[PDB]
């Protein structure tokens, strides 16, 4: 799941940035309302499906679809913020969703179930996992200070400068993405334990904590100082935007 | 001195949150109250120098999001409106820290409560002191978070969990 | 028998409805002295209908009683804080028994 | 309660009463004060006060950026 969501998903958006957008500038302009519509629908609709999922891994998987369609709005905005934000969200998603799949796997390796109904109350037995899970829950909500907020806001900036309607529909994911991330976290971690389903518990061991460390450092490092990444990108981003025009 | 105003409550919350197992209920209560109260005293000094002395303070730490004309920055603005809100926030928070010291004495989880109190204070300071809209947005969201964490501070109660989600 | 159980079951419905209507009277009155007058009045109705022996007209009075209680019920009833629905319910509850904590999980060996 | 005594947490769990909590509290005091020293030095270096105060103020003791941004048509 880590490889599928963190790397393989990036190949379609990478292919849009490397081939379609620069090689066919005229067609890209013609299909911009078409891409805007498909992405906006996917953001609204799949966010609402995520709300009604009952499997831990299904909620995280469905969240990935909405994040990736916001990426496409950014890259097809065709400006520095949109394309710059789209690349940063792509990178952020590969860290946040990967960390989230690692949290669910931590739960699954021990108890062998993905159904949210069985869990709950976990803060009283696994406080270390609960704290790490909350942090990546916030990063999945694009909380300011996390890596995902930088890419998210930059894409909305770039979309607003082109079409204020698509930027408005895309900004609805701030409300929807908050709803399913906190509902997921609370039903798993908060509340009371249910000893009839689960009664034996182990918090993270040394290998699992170490696994989470570079994800926390990377998420914080991009969230507070994205300049180390944006500086190395802006020259390539600028020439991608200018490709096909001479004024 | 102006950076110590904003970042002292963060330091107080950091010690209680990460090292509350070494301080206990009494140690974490003193730690978070002292840092917030010191920041309260510096805020009184800042009100005297900026509002009474008519001398505004501008402080820029580093850029946050620099993308073409987009220029969100880690920057702080201290004018007459700012030091009024600094006084309100730091003074009331210091009292509430003192009040909670005995109000939550019988609670099993006081150190986490004091840590959440100080992190709220730090985000509210980041809201009133920012010099751009994005830093204000960071404070705006941070106080939304800290409020959520404190409304369901009794995580076992279902109405608190319903209320905290509704607030957010 | 059956008439005993059927009438005894009808007995329980009346006694509970009196219990609920008597507590909801204190919700609307607040003050003790106003509650004395209002409790006496509520009792007198249960006494006006206590003579009815038509088991069927009783089932009809009981159903009319529940409808009256459900209609004129206080929208904000009082709850003891530790009781279900109270302000202190499920706050710092005692840990459940039967919880075990495993050490040295997931070792390479 | 019973099982929470076997559960490790950063904030200490319920009714945390470390025996040496006073020396740990005082050690924690020193760390914050040692952390505050570079912060204060950087703050003093970074502050910008374009206006002279009406009366002398405590930040004139350590801050040397008073009345500096007068030439504004030169800022870049």
């Amino acid at each position: 799941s880590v490889i599928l969501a963190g790397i393989l998903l990036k190949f379609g958006t990478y292919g849009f940035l490397r081939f379609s957008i620069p090689m066919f500038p005229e067609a890209t302009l013609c299909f911009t309302p078409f891409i805007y519509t498909l992405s906006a629908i996917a953001i609204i609709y799949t966010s609402l499906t995520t709300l009604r999922q009952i499997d831990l891994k299904k909620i995280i998987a469905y969240s990935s679809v909405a994040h990736m369609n916001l990426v496409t709005i950014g890259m097809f905005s065709l400006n520095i913020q949109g394309i710059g934000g789209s690349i940063l969200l792509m990178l952020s998603h590969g860290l946040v969703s990967s960390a989230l799949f690692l949290c669910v796997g931590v739960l699954y390796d021990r108890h062998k179930t993905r159904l949210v109904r069985y869990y709950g109350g976990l803060v009283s037995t696994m406080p270390n996992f609960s704290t790490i899970f909350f942090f990546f829950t916030l990063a999945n909500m694009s909380l300011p200070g996390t890596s995902s907020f930088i890419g998210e806001f930059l894409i909305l900036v770039g979309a607003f400068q082109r079409n204020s309607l698509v930027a408005t529909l895309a900004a609805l994911g701030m409300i929807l993405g908050a709803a399913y991330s906190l509902w997921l976290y609370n039903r798993v971690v908060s509340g009371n334990l249910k000893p009839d389903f689960l009664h034996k518990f182990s918090d993270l061991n040394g290998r699992e904590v170490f696994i989470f460390i570079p994800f926390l450092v990377g998420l914080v490092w991009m969230g507070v100082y994205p300049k180390v990444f944006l500086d190395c990108m802006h020259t390539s981003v600028s020439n991608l935007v200018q490709h096909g025009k001479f004024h | 001195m102006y950076l110590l105003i904003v970042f002292l409550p963060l330091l107080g919350s950091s010690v209680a949150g990460f090292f509350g197992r070494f301080l206990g209920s009494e140690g974490s209560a003193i730690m978070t109250t002292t840092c917030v109260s010191f920041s309260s005293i510096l805020s009184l000094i800042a009100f005297y120098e900026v509002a009474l002395g008519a001398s505004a303070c501008y402080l820029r730490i580093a850029p946050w999001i620099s993308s073409e004309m987009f220029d969100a920055s880690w920057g702080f603005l201290f004018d007459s409106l700012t030091v009024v809100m600094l006084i309100v926030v730091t003074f009331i928070s210091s009292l509430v820290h003192l009040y909670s010291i005995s109000y939550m004495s019988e609670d099993p989880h006081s150190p986490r409560f004091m840590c959440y109190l100080s992190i709220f204070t730090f985000f509210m300071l980041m809201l009133v002191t920012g010099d751009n809209f994005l830093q204000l947005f960071l404070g705006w969201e941070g106080v939304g978070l800290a409020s959520y964490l404190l409304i369901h501070f009794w995580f076992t109660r279902l109405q608190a969990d319903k209320a905290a989600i509704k607030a957010m | 028998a059956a008439y005993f159980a059927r009438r005894a079951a009808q007995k329980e419905r009346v006694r509970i409805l009196y219990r609920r209507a008597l507590k909801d009277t204190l919700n609307w009155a607040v003050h003790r002295h106003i509650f004395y007058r209002d409790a006496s009045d509520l009792r007198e109705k249960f006494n006006v209908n206590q003579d009815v022996e038509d088991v069927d007209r009783i089932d009809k009075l009981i159903a009319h009683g529940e409808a009256e209680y459900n209609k004129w019920r206080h929208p904000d009833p009082y709850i003891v804080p530790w009781a279900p629905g109270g302000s202190k319910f499920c706050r710092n509850p005692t840990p459940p028994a039967g919880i075990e904590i495993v050490y040295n999980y997931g070792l390479e060996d | 309660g019973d099982f929470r005594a076997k559960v490790w947490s950063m904030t200490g769990g319920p009714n945390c009463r470390p025996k040496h909590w006073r020396r740990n509290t005082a050690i924690a005091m020193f760390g914050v004060f040692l952390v505050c020293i570079p912060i204060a030095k950087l703050s003093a270096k970074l502050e910008q006060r374009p206006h002279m105060p009406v009366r002398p103020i405590p930040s004139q003791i350590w801050c040397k950026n008073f009345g500096t941004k007068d030439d504004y048509e030169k800022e870049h």
Binding site: N128, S202, D203, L204, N205, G206, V209 | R21, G24, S25, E26, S105 | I101, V102, Y103, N104, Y105 | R4, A5, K6, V7, W8, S9, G12, G13, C16, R17, P18, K19, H20, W21, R22
Partner: peptide, 28 residues
Amino acid sequence: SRWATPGHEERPKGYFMNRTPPAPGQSR
């Protein structure tokens, strides 16, 4: 009394990363 009588936790509750400590004098 909460400020003048030291605490009772001779050692903290639980173990960091849930690993039992090694034998006295031994290293992990």
